[PDB]
Amino acid sequence: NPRTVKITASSEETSGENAPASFASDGDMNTFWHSKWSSPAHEGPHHLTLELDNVYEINKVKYAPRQDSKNGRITGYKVSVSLDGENFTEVKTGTLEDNAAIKFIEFDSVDAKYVRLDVTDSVSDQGRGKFATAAEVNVHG
Ligand SMILES: OC[C@H]1O[C@@H](O)[C@H](O)[C@@H](O)[C@H]1O
Ligand SMILES: [Ca+2]
DSSP states (O other): OOOEEEEEESOOBOSSSOBOGGGGSSSOTTOOEEOOOSSSOOOSOOEEEEEEEEEEEEEEEEEEOOSSOOTTOEEEEEEEEESSSSSEEEEEEEEOOSSSSOEEEEEEEEEEEEEEEEEEEEOOOOOTTTOOEESEEEEEO
8 A cells, every 4th residue: 555656775776787776566476676776886875765655654675685696695684764854754674584575564553754774784706795686565453
């Protein structure tokens, strides 16, 4: 029910491959957002912010890792909510297992128009923290 109308990111890759932030919001597990890795690489801090079409009561973020590589797989996160897009309130901080499984970050119900996923840690095939990727990210109530 919470519907993402817009997604913005710290950075995105569109030169070395086509991996824009919108690819984290397109319902397709075969497309991923990637932080900019082509020179000059953006090495963080990485984040993804979802703008919803209304204020929703939310209690879960789904984070589906890219399925073809561990590059940018998020292992450390903060989730924050906002009504205006500038003033955020942290609702959850934690770690995520280093595997390709869809992750479900759960917290007490809270109103949000914007949901920001800040990366505090990530892994790579090779590395830590340099990249961030997501096949899909969305929010649920
Ligand atoms: O160096 C970063 C890059 O590494 C590549 O091997 C991978 O195909 C890209 O998606 C990107 O993660
Ligand atoms: Ca996708």
